Design an enzyme around this catalytic site. Structure first.
Site, PDB file in Angstrom:
ATOM      1  N   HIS A   1       0.885  -1.246  -0.043  1.00 43.84           N
ATOM      2  CA  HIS A   1       0.092   0.107  -0.139  1.00 43.84           C
ATOM      3  C   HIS A   1       0.834   1.315  -0.120  1.00 43.84           C
ATOM      4  O   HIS A   1       0.546   2.214  -0.353  1.00 43.84           O
ATOM      5  CB  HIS A   1      -1.109  -0.159   1.040  1.00 43.84           C
ATOM      6  CG  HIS A   1      -0.612   0.153   2.629  1.00 43.84           C
ATOM      7  ND1 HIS A   1      -0.716  -0.709   3.187  1.00 43.84           N
ATOM      8  CD2 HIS A   1       0.045   1.316   2.942  1.00 43.84           C
ATOM      9  CE1 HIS A   1      -0.468  -0.027   4.706  1.00 43.84           C
ATOM     10  NE2 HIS A   1       0.111   1.352   4.265  1.00 43.84           N
TER      11      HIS A   1
ATOM     12  N   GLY B   1       2.107   6.500   9.722  1.00 47.66           N
ATOM     13  CA  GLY B   1       3.431   6.163   9.431  1.00 47.66           C
ATOM     14  C   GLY B   1       4.280   4.688   9.828  1.00 47.66           C
ATOM     15  O   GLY B   1       5.260   4.680   9.349  1.00 47.66           O
TER      16      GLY B   1
ATOM     17  N   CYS C   1       3.256   1.859   9.366  1.00 53.34           N
ATOM     18  CA  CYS C   1       3.123   0.641   8.464  1.00 53.34           C
ATOM     19  C   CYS C   1       4.698   0.057   7.880  1.00 53.34           C
ATOM     20  O   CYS C   1       5.485   1.262   7.993  1.00 53.34           O
ATOM     21  CB  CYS C   1       2.216   1.070   7.316  1.00 53.34           C
ATOM     22  SG  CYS C   1       0.704   1.427   7.738  1.00 53.34           S
TER      23      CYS C   1
END
Lengths: 304, 304
Positions: free
Chosen positions: A41, A143, A145
């Site tokens: 993503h 932030g 991830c």
């Protein structure tokens, strides 16, 4: 003596954290050998997240679009591929700090440490468990991830989790390092509800054994039970069924304390039925389930 | 979202841990620059611990009696001195992994991370607080002495604690890195009882603010109180007195949530008087006091 929610030392994993940017999105990546792993993503805009076609979005991306920075130095991307829900960015430099490692897919009830990162920099480390509904209860802000979960066996890091998302209920979902989500979750900003968050019975019993080893013994009673009787109570209280495999895994703890596993089950049964009555066990007013029998043995013996 | 008991990344401290042996005793040491710091009780036999005269015991020790091993390589000891309850072993090699560091003496209520070590090797990391009675509730087995507590500000490690002993009650006592014990404790195997372990009120309020930020809001009530009224309740429940300095420190959290500090005090007052009624806050059935207002801000903003 004493028993704490303990995470593995994070140094080995800190040396693998990098920043990955694609367009306007910046998240974390894991650099092992000459590959950087990160959530796919990273290629999405917040809009794309509503209904992303990852293969189509990836066609518009070239190696030079993935900006990978390790500390304050840029890594050169010479290849990229998608494996399930993770991107693998091949770089021209092997990570000199790559520890001995394995990728493992854990089962619910298993614990691990998470190194929460932002912009490729470690912010903190905490201990988690894979819940029976395949979510984790972490502490992740935007932030984070690409932050990873892991276990360590002497010098080998077994990576088991990579952070991908927060469900609208505040619980977390992610993948193993092969990009497969734990549970039924998808990397799409859509209606995703978690199932029943049942209690990990074998972990509670392990923690009751840790309590006995560390002197907190008030809950020990004069009773015993059977696996079938205990399991009727466990079902009523949304506790996972206890199996003979779990009883076998608790064997070393039963041997050390001299308390038969089924006697500890009867203590747990009374705790479920009567409550704590304002008392505490190992500094907790609830039954703790994020310590496995292996964690209890490890912490009670001082494995380094 | 989510809020966890989070420790600092331990890598910077892992690079400083060494093994110190004197005679038959092996414990941990902290290697910063060309000095290795360790508890002075490394020179004692279990017998000596009953009534040790450290200056006299140290006269029988030479540099070559202190065996310092960093990983699998031996360090050469070229000097030794005692500073309060710690030994400083001068080595011929500066630790190449020495981070930017400071030695700080913390006050009760302040939190820190502990890197539990055995034989100079890190076993785990967990978050602690200096209790108001100057003990800590750690997880330390025999061999863990010399394990350290620390805080990190970007790249500077502020060491605040070195483990020395366990009291007969299972709580822990240690020194700052200048060798001064926290509290009235002494490095002698004698009758040492801790005082009242009161609750760190300012930390509880900080954690209630963290709960509101993370969506757990059931405990918010329609009431307010005054510092004097709240403090009458705090005294009754063995909570530390709340001062205007604490209210000032909670200012940023009050601003972010829009809940006046005294309104949060009234919520805490009702929680103390009525209990949790079987409910939980941030996954806890008790009021958590090992998060400072600074920890709450840091974790809620993602400081790396």
């Amino acid at each position: 003596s004493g028993f704490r929610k303990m995470a593995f030392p994070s140094g080995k994993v800190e040396g693998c954290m990098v920043q990955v940017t694609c367009g306007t999105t910046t998240l974390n990546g894991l650099w092992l050998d000459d590959v950087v792993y990160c959530p796919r993503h990273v290629i999405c805009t917040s809009e794309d997240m509503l209904n992303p076609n990852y293969e189509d979005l990836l066609i518009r991306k070239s190696n030079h679009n993935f900006l990978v920075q390790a500390g304050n130095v840029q890594l050169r991307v010479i290849g990229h591929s998608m494996q399930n829900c993770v991107l693998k960015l091949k770089v021209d430099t092997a990570n000199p700090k790559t520890p001995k490692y394995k990728f493992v897919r854990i089962q619910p009830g298993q614990t691990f440490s998470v190194l929460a990162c932002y912009n490729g920099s470690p912010s903190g480390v905490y201990q988690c468990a894979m819940r029976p509904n395949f979510t984790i209860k972490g502490s992740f802000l935007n932030g984070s991830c690409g932050s990873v979960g892991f276990n360590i066996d002497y010098d080998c890091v077994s990576f088991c989790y990579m952070h991908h998302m927060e469900l609208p209920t505040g619980v977390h979902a992610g993948t193993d390092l092969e990009g497969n989500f734990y549970g039924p979750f998808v990397d799409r900003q859509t209606a995703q509800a978690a199932g029943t968050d049942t209690t990990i019975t074998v972990n509670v019993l392990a923690w009751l054994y840790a309590a006995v080893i560390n002197g907190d013994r008030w809950f020990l009673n004069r009773f015993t039970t059977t696996l079938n009787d205990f399991n009727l109570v466990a079902m009523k209280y949304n506790y996972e069924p206890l199996t003979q495999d779990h009883v076998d895994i608790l064997g070393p703890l039963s041997a050390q304390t001299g308390i038969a596993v089924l006697d500890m089950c009867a203590s747990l049964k009374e705790l479920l039925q009567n409550g704590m009555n304002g008392r505490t066990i190992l500094g907790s007013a609830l039954l703790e389930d994020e310590f496995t029998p292996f964690d209890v043995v490890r912490q009670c013996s001082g494995v380094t």
